[PDB]
Amino acid sequence: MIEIKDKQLTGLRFIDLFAGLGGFRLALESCGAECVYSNEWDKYAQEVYEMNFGEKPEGDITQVNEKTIPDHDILCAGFPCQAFSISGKQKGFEDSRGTLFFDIARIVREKKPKVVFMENVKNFASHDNGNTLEVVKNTMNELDYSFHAKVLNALDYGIPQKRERIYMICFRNDLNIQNFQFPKPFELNTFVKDLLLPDSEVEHLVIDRKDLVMTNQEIEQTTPKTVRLGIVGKGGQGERIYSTRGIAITLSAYGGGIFAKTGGYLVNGKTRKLHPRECARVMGYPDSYKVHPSTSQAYKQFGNSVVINVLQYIAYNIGSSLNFKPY
DNA sequence: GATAGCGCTATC
DNA sequence: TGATAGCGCTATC
Numbered sequence: 001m002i003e004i005k006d007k008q009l010t011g012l013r014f015i016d017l018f019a020g021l022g023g024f025r026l027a028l029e030s031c032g033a034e035c036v037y038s039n040e041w042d043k044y045a046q047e048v049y050e051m052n053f054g055e056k057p058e059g060d061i062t063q064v065n066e067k068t069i070p071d072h073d074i075l076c077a078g079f080p081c082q083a084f085s086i087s088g089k090q091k092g093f094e095d096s097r098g099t100l101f102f103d104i105a106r107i108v109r110e111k112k113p114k115v116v117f118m119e120n121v122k123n124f125a126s127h128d129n130g131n132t133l134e135v136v137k138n139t140m141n142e143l144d145y146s147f148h149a150k151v152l153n154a155l156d157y158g159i160p161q162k163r164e165r166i167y168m169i170c171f172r173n174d175l176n177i178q179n180f181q182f183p184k185p186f187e188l189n190t191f192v193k194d195l196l197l198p199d200s201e202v203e204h205l206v207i208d209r210k211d212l213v214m215t216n217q218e219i220e221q222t223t224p225k226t227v228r229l230g231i232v233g234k235g236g237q238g239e240r241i242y243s244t245r246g247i248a249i250t251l252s253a254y255g256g257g258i259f260a261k262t263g264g265y266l267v268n269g270k271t272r273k274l275h276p277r278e279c280a281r282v283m284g285y286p287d288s289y290k291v292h293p294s295t296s297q298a299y300k301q302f303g304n305s306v307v308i309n310v311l312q313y314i315a316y317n318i319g320s321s322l323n324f325k326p327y
Numbered sequence: 328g329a330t331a332g333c334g335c336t337a338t339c
Numbered sequence: 340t341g342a343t344a345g346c347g348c349t350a351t352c
């Protein structure tokens with residue numbers, strides 16, 4: 001994350017729906033706002049949350065009487081995306097995990113926060129010929145909110161990872177907010193190699209495999225793109241090796257493959273996956289963040305998390321628009 | 328709950 | 340196209 005001294009969101013209160021690791025917290029808190037509620041049902045995520053914020057989230061949002069949710073100004077939600085990702089069986093709203101948005105909508109209908117800040121994957125924008133986004137747009141518009149959205153790739157915001165997400169910022173119609181804008185991109189100056197941990201601490205993750213077919217030669221110049229170097233096995237998800245001179249490929253949560261969830265990188269002659277701390281770093285988490293003890297749950301956790309640095313810029317601009325109340 | 332082999336889609 | 344990527348899917352222990 002980056003330091004932000006101009007704390008635009010200082011007096012505001014927000015809720016962290018679908019908490020996960022708490023990325024949305026970190027993001028908004030660095031901007032001065034305060035978290036009044038958090039919700040997350042996964043047993044392991046709750047533990048990491050508690051270990052890092054001292055609060056244990058409420059359970060199954062589905063059976064939470066919305067009226068119980070504390071008065072808030074910003075509603076943050078990085079709702080589930082198995083149902084819309086280009087990586088699955090795109091069952092959209094027909095999937096048991098694709099209707100959470102409607103849960104957001106009922107919390108919004110009742111509580112009416114000034115801002116709704118949501119996040120999901122790039123394909124949510126194209127899914128079902130854009131009908132899902134349309135349902136989300138029209139549902140939001142019907143509850144008296146403006147709907148702003150754009151696909152932003154993290155590598156354009158200081159983090160060496162190709163995580164293309166769609167961010168939807170919604171403002172209550174009252175506040176005539178007509179000057180919101182998404183952070184302007186900027187040149188990448190940090191690559192995977194800059195975040196790697198010292199070899200000594202990584203040893204146990206090296207994976208020498210005989211089917212390591214090297215398909216491309218290492219690069220001399222750093223590039224803001226994923227340079228694939230090798231393939232292992234048939235080269236499916238998890239069995240592709242990239243150069244530490246490019247940018248990390250999207251980290252995933254249920255991913256498989258020998259280099260499961262993080263992908264595999266060629267670090268100093270050796271082929272290995274990423275340590276949980278390097279995922280934290282590749283996601284923009286501060287090194288002070290306590291990662292969960294179970295490496296498998298840590299990777300799952302960072303896999304469906306969010307790139308803080310990006311949310312920081314957006315939260316900042318969300319704050320600016322709200323604070324422009326001239327006479 | 329932890330592991331890994333798979334097999335599909337979107338995008339230009 | 341032809342090659343790459345993907346907050347994934349699911350069987351086995």
Ligand SMILES: Nc1ncnc2c1ncn2[C@@H]1O[C@H](CSCC[C@H](N)C(=O)O)[C@@H](O)[C@H]1O
Nearest residue numbers: 018019020021023040041042061078305306
């Ligand atoms: N019904 C439900 N109630 C509560 N949490 C749920 C849920 N369905 C899914 N979740 C949780 O929703 C989260 C989506 S991932 C969001 C991660 C979060 N933005 C962070 O930065 O890490 C997952 O942790 C998932 O376990």
